[PDB]
Symmetry: D2
Subunit: 252 residues, 4 copies
């Protein structure tokens, strides 16, 4: 099942889509500059691109580290990104009250892994009618994603994306089970599956190996965060090379 996000086709058998940007919206000029560079590189390589950032990072390293610009200023920044570059945007939501105002501006709204089973937030997100990215919790097995998917379907929304970010592996460590992608495809109606390589890690050699491994299984998209910015092009050339190959061959 494919999902149209403006003029982009997202699907497990379509050219991969890059979800990328910055961790926290900190500033207007810096967000536009970072986005500009993603846009330049992705346009150069013909890779569909969705800009990603959080306006309210609810899980932070210290209690007083900057949470981000907040809802109202964040949505203004997202508006400017869309106007300037003509691209879709993605951001997370943490409270039901945020869902409507965020969905009015943003093309994809994201369900944070730690809130993945909060029924109130799931219903509130489903009822926006927006395309939704479901972050798979590290403590949740790939077969348990259909339970989240069914809660969205009950509440009236089937425009869902499932996002791998790794699995708990002993203490303080993550492993990405490459078979999980297929389990999610076969148990959740072949909805688009994307891979958050950044949060699946802990290094640029690791990210590349892990991204290539993932994309070899035939995925709708790759999800990353950047600070290295200038090595983006070399990275994407490799991802595109593998994706073009995999996608050019019929499924067996």
């Amino acid at each position: 099942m494919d999902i149209k996000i403006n003029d982009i086709t997202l699907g497990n058998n379509s050219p991969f889509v890059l979800f990328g940007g910055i961790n926290v919206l900190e500033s207007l000029d810096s967000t536009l500059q970072t986005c500009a560079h993603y846009v330049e590189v992705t346009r150069k390589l013909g890779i569909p691109y969705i800009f990603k950032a959080s306006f309210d990072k609810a899980n932070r390293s210290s209690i007083h580290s900057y949470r981000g610009v907040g809802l109202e200023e964040g949505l203004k920044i997202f508006e400017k990104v869309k106007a300037e570059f003509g691209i879709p945007v993605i951001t997370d939501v943490h409270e039901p009250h945020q869902c409507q105002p965020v969905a009015e501006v943003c093309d994809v709204i994201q369900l944070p892994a730690f809130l993945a089973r909060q029924t109130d937030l799931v219903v509130a997100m489903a009822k926006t009618g927006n395309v939704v990215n479901i972050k798979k919790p590290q403590f949740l097995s790939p077969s348990q994603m259909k339970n989240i998917v069914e809660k969205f379907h009950e509440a009236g929304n089937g425009k869902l994306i499932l996002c791998e970010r790794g699995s708990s592996f002993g203490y303080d460590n993550l492993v990405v089970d490459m078979l999980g992608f297929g389990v999610m495809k076969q148990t959740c109606g072949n909805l688009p599956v994307i891979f958050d390589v950044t949060h699946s890690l802990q290094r640029r050699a690791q990210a590349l190996d892990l991204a290539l491994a993932g994309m070899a299984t035939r995925l709708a998209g790759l999800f990353l965060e950047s600070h290295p910015l200038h090595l983006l092009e070399d990275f994407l050339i490799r991802i595109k090379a593998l994706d073009d190959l995999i996608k050019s061959q019929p499924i067996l």
Copy 2:
């Protein structure tokens, strides 16, 4: 470090405190019925007791499944429970705005395991000044608990209980690492550590007993559960072990 909750002394070298009650509050009458049972068994065995309940099921089976009586109704029931039995109570909170009004009624407020890293909830809970129970996430190392403790401490609240609930073990399984209790005690300033045996699980009663005794053998401040006279039989054995452990020099 000990924590006083009314006339109960909670701490890792004190007689263990039982935390128990129901999953989610449905009605006044069934709530008072469950609590009376717990008070009856715990009084005759001489075990300090704190009643536990959630006013909301945050993760429902269905979009249209029953959720619980909610905040305003839940709090009224907790006020009744306290009035009738004169015992402390504990409930979990899921949104920052809920923290202060829950804290007015409930002696201990609980940080759910999924929300343990929600910085706004941590602050709001800390602001209340109430005793806080921190549910250790199944995906978090015991040595990482010190980071959650630090945040409560920078938010001005040191009345913290650390609660074990097992660790992710492959897919859809949990294991309890008995060494984690010790790591938490050493790294988090000997705050009271309690063991949620109920959530650490998923002959099934025999399992809870083996697991509870193994946990309590490491010297814990309390035992946390949801649950012939099966509670009685269980607690008689736990108290015997706890009495022995706590009578040995550290």
Copy 3:
């Protein structure tokens, strides 16, 4: 199911048995010294005691680490330990051909975790008729122990002990599942279950004590060490064990 080892009763509802000693046998004099210390401490507390050592260690830290005195001298040393102290002994075997001669002297023969599924060894061990200690591999679930037990039964030996050593938990780390003991008792006919607390670590003595107490709280036939510190430790284990064993299994 109980197992008689000379005058010792080993079982999940009998007073715990201590298994311990030295890593590898070097000399008669050196062995008698360590053994004598274990014997004196355990005798002082009335804890039954089985002395453990390897005569030929297959899984050494380095290629050229001393392997031990070897079969012939090793067995002479075990014979002396038995005569001097009147206690049973335990040793690992890793080749089928050594099982019979070792079983002439050693009361309990031990199957290394890494050879737990080597059918040849299992059969050679079974055929001795001796009590056998099966070390559970860290990658084997407690519900798989039944299969090892079945292979010993097929080979004519039911006198088996199951030895817990921990489970792989991510990379490097081991975790001991306290529920595994129960699963093994329930699925393997209540064969005696012992707890190798030392391997299970990785150690700190504080950690050893917590982990040992936790496991013994589940009601176990014995405690296995790969080791007045021993006295203080054994006093605590005995306290817990006497309490647990004194109470009826849940009604």
Copy 4:
């Protein structure tokens, strides 16, 4: 570091080598039927190929299982394979005495995962000077493979292949950490790293094995290790397609 095996160059930046065949040798006629199929498919695909088989199943299902053809007959069959086809072969060895006589014939000798820490077997395999395939235990982290490599180097053999087979993940389940390939490259002097996709999966279909094989080979590996109306050929066309692409990109 590359390794020459007859006319095959094995290395993490060379075209992948297939290590392929069966579980155990049963008949000489049944073995040639399998090998001939592997050879014709790989030759037309231009994939270098090494024939794999065991001469003994050391972990029987029951005590009364089909162990296999045995050593004496096995070596004769491997002879016949190398004469007929002109390819290298690989097999596992489980006892130190077997190593030199097996290495006289079999180009690559394999350290079973369960015996990874058997020091006598490591030294015996090392001493043959043959290329050695090290099966990574499901319980060993990739950071710790360097310890086995260390022992082989110390015993004087550097022609080592590292074979990934998955990692213990909870009970009775395996996960393959795609990052471990890189860890092993970086910590073990860039020795050839191969991927046993078959064993990595036997706790979970061709669809599965393909996804997993493609993911692993995407990390740039020296080879693929497997077991088994034209499924191998179709499967290998897809692997070669990805390998060719990956190997043509600069590191």
